Design a protein around this nucleic acid. Structure first.
Ligand SMILES: *P(=O)(O)OCC(C)(C)[C@@H](O)C(=O)NCCC(=O)NCCS
Lengths: 72, 135, 147, 147, 134
DNA sequence: TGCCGTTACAATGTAACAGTGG
DNA sequence: CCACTGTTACATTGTAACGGCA
């Protein structure tokens, strides 16, 4: 469904496939994306949904599931 | 079919297309062997003044890949050749900056009409403002 | 203050453009990074010494390397074709492919019958050994021919 | 950071050749004293190899003359000498080549060799710029509200 | 000068352009006699993989009347090559029906704007009219 | 003036969608 | 169904005409 956006974009931003990401893991260390890569991921998410996410809320996406939690 | 198909013209178009593709380096032939491909290309070259035989050469040595591109290019060429008769049926080519084209294409996809129709609607609204200013 | 609001709107649209640039750039980076991970990036491509050099000099350096490659790859035809394709600025990945296309080719022509090093950079030593051996064989052959 | 940034490219190139040069050898270089120690090991290996290379060359010439006057057993030994001579011939060349790189390495890059990584300091200092920015905001806020 | 010029790239561009023109039948060389023209074209063909010598070839045998066309073609190639890196600097090409193009060009000539600027203004006025009504 | 960016075209080639009739 | 045709929306390259600038 609409989550297909996130679970697609994440992979396109991290080089992993759609099913590679696990909800329990964390982007910062368990996916290999460093600070710059995570900034790029969150900002691409911002672009895709034509919305805005301030720094404080944006910093709360270190886990895989959060990417949908704030979305839906 | 809206446009009359002329055999002695489309055959020449097809031959020219094959020659252009070959001289551009693409493998028009379906042959992987060098010798047969060279012979087929040479025969096609001999077929310059006999466009009628080009259809047979196509059916005999044409690469299976190129049928779709062939049927597309000659179809488009026929449309353009018949439209070039009158100005009011011609097309004009213009280049647009990425932001402008992005906005215009988004608007057209929103209204579900072609780019020319969207431009018509925009210029018509502007001309309606001008008309009511004039009255 | 309304003018300041309009200025903020201008800033927002500029931000939108910049964000689109960045996201497209990363989308491109995805596949090139995936393919370069066949030991290409480990130390070869990522010449981190260049991280502090403006693109103006990098363009000229790449241009000079291309000029050299034109002469070097004249004999080979598949490598020549790949080099030709790799000049398009809108298909960056092709450049990396050329590098792979080199190494792979440099791996095929190793003549592994008497050579083993998959990495061509280490095949130079075995090639030099081969030249030394062949020079000794040349001396022996010349003596035999004379007699 | 302006000073450190100007220091990063020279340092970064100097260490990159060291690691590449390190890969060429079986040891890890992490000190000026070690480099001299390995260089002498390199030089002493050079003198020994040339002594053996000259020794096998003497054996080859004697056997070549023996075959010239005239047998298969002589041919077999000559082939073995050629193999050993080639094996020892490349060893001298490689050791000489390794020394040349070391001499150039110490001639150019010895000024910044085995030094601190300025990238780490630049990362830390730049990190202080942002963490300093918080001090800008949290003191701008105080002056904005209390006034 | 806005775009930096690279010799090994523009020279390849020039060689490709001249080869294309020769294959199209254009007279590349200034020699009316066919023998000299063929010799010069063969020199160019075998001259591949060389900037420093294709430049000299152009200086020595290039047809005088094609200089301007080649110069402007290389200008356009340089600009397009450098602009094709980023999305926002690219150009989107479309085909407009002749009446629509005629009206749009009438407006652009009347107002002194370009087609891109004219379309931007028209879309902005449409949006403003929407906001007025809404 | 001559180079250099820039615009507005022209000509041709393709992919994708919409129609039409066998 | 299936194929063939018409049309639109691009890309790609080349060219002529303006206008800026040393
Ligand atoms: P990390 O070594 O990958 O570096 C990340 C980064 C410092 C380059 C940068 O992308 C980042 O993560 N910055 C944190 C957010 C920030 O500084 N925002 C400033 C907004 S004006």
């Amino acid at each position: 469904t609409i989550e297909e956006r996130v679970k697609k974009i994440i992979g396109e931003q991290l080089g992993v496939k759609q099913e590679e990401v696990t909800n329990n893991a964390s982007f910062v260390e368990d996916l290999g994306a460093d600070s710059l890569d995570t900034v790029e991921l969150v900002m691409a998410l911002e672009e895709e949904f034509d919305t805005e996410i301030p720094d404080e809320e944006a910093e709360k996406i270190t886990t895989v599931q959060a990417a949908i939690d704030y979305i839906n | 079919m809206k446009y009359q198909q002329l055999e002695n013209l489309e055959c020449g178009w097809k031959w020219a297309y094959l020659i252009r593709k070959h001289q551009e380096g693409e493998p028009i032939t379906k042959y992987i062997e060098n010798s047969a491909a060279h012979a087929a290309v040479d025969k096609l070259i001999k077929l310059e003044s006999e466009p009628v035989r080009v259809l047979e050469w196509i059916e005999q040595h044409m690469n299976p890949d190129l049928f779709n591109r062939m049927k597309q290019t000659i179809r488009a060429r026929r449309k353009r050749h018949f439209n070039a008769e009158h100005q009011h049926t011609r097309k004009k080519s213009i280049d647009l900056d990425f932001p402008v084209w992005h906005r215009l294409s988004a608007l057209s996809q929103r209204r579900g009409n072609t780019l020319s129709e969207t431009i018509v609607q925009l210029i018509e609204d502007a001309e309606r403002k001008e008309k009511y200013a004039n009255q | 203050m309304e003018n300041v609001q309009k200025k903020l709107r201008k800033l927002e649209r500029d931000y939108y453009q910049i964000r689109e640039q960045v996201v497209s750039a990363k989308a491109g980076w995805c596949a090139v990074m995936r393919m370069v991970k066949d030991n290409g990036v480990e130390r070869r491509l990522h010449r981190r010494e260049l991280a502090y050099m403006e693109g103006g000099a990098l363009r000229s350096m790449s241009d000079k390397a291309l000029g050299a490659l034109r002469l070097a790859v004249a004999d080979n035809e598949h490598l020549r074709d790949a080099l030709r394709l790799s000049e398009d600025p809108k298909r960056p990945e092709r450049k990396v492919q050329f590098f792979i296309a080199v190494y792979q080719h440099l791996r095929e022509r190793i003549r592994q019958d008497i050579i083993r090093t998959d990495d061509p950079v280490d095949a130079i030593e075995q090639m030099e050994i081969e030249l030394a051996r062949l020079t000794e064989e040349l001396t022996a052959r010349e003596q035999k021919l004379a007699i | 950071i302006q000073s450190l940034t100007a220091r990063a490219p020279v340092w970064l190139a100097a260490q990159d050749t060291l690691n590449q040069l390190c890969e060429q050898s079986g040891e890890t270089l992490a000190s000026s004293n070690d480099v001299t120690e390995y260089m002498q090991q390199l030089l002493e290996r050079e003198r020994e190899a040339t002594v053996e290379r000259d020794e096998v060359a003497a054996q080859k010439r004697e056997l070549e003359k023996q075959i010239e006057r005239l047998l298969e057993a002589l041919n077999l030994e000559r082939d073995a000498l050629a193999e050993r001579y080639a094996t020892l011939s490349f060893d001298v060349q490689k050791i000489q080549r390794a020394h040349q790189a070391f001499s150039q390495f110490v001639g150019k890059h010895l000024s910044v060799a085995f030094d601190t990584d300025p990238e780490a300091e630049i990362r830390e200092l730049r990190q202080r710029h942002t963490e300093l920015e918080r001090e800008v905001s949290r003191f701008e806020d105080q002056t904005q509200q209390q006034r």
